[PDB]
Design a protein around this ligand. Structure first.
Ligand code: CL
Lengths: 226, 225
């Protein structure tokens, strides 16, 4: 079929940069344990949908086991914008903003997610001050981190921006994003991005693979990021 | 000697996360109830309320007067925002354990209320409605800025300028230096100056000394695309 619009990809990608991670998790795993019988335990076969784009955020999802792919568009030509690992959290900030989810989460491997519905979420915050307080820290961290990344791109040459984006996205020196998605995140023309990546590759800074990019010279790439 | 473009840009976008009105974490009734908790600070014009690069050690609520937010040496200051009664600042850097990134100076006689770190934690620990409202407030304030930044991506500069003027306008008025407008867009003053003069020739805006008035909102929205 057809790929989603540049606008849809850009919006999904940057909003997906506010997901909760290890260092920014709103609940400790021990808090999660204590919520047993309140959290709903959901199992997912590979390929199964956890939540749908454009549907109201009606609770908080915690990844417990497996990997969850975040993507926008039709399955065949969807744009992957992120991957959630065990401990990661999504749904809470859009709930706080009374917004729908703007991408779809699907199990990439056999997965278990824990669901805190809206009512349970409100009750938790109304009754547990320490949990409310850590949630506030988490939200501040996650949204500010995204903002600061957008701010930092401004006023810099595009190759510096691409270099910086790769460095920021890399996990174990790997960026698992399509070139099209990188272009969308930077508001850049796709041929412009291709040429930069090709130059970085020629200069032995990166390797461009099958919708993944490998960093081969971190210090050299840091220099391009200025 | 002046602040750098990156300094101005950073301070300006951070200043766009100030809590105001519906987005403020404390409403007027909360502030009244916190009378014997909040420290009342009085200022004369030119007084420094808080300094760039200093540790955020509490939350500021403006009660009376106007507070100019700016970066750079005093003589070469770039103004990035004005706080008005009801505005709340300092809470996000406090939550992040980060420094203030701009200096607040009183423009007028001013009264600010200060909720120090210890009082802030005690409030959050004992007031569930204010704790829950703070959560939504931080999310809303920063996301609103995030959305403005996202919406600039890949757009032509004249549309960005038109959109920024529309977003900044209070009662059709924008009080920022052209160099600051340019820094917020990641651009240089001559580029912005050329665009504003063309907008002014088409009777969309009127341009003064660090002040722009919108005179044709429909026309300017058209340019914002
Ligand atoms: Cl491409």
């Amino acid at each position: 079929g057809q790929p989603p619009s540049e606008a849809q990809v850009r919006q999904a990608a940057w909003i997906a940069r506010c997901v909760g991670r290890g260092g920014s998790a709103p609940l400790h795993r021990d808090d999660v344990s204590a919520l047993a019988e309140t959290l709903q335990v959901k199992e997912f076969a590979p390929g199964a949908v956890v939540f749908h784009a454009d549907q109201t955020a009606d609770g908080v999802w915690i990844v417990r086991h497996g990997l969850i792919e975040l993507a926008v568009g039709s399955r065949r030509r969807r744009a992957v914008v992120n991957i959630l690992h065990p401990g990661d959290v999504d749904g809470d900030i859009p709930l706080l903003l009374e917004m729908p989810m703007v991408y779809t989460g699907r199990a990439l491997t056999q997965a278990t997610c824990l669901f805190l519905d809206r009512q349970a979420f409100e009750r938790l915050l109304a009754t547990h001050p320490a949990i409310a307080r850590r949630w506030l820290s988490s939200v501040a961290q996650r949204v500010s981190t995204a903002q600061i990344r957008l701010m930092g791109m401004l006023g810099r040459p595009l190759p510096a921006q691409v270099a910086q984006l790769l460095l920021d996205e890399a996990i174990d020196a790997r960026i698992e994003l399509a070139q099209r998605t990188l272009a969308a995140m930077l508001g850049a023309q796709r041929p412009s991005i291709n040429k930069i990546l090709k130059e970085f590759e020629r200069d032995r800074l990166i390797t461009v693979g099958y919708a993944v990019i490998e960093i081969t010279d971190q210090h050299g790439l840091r220099a391009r990021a200025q």
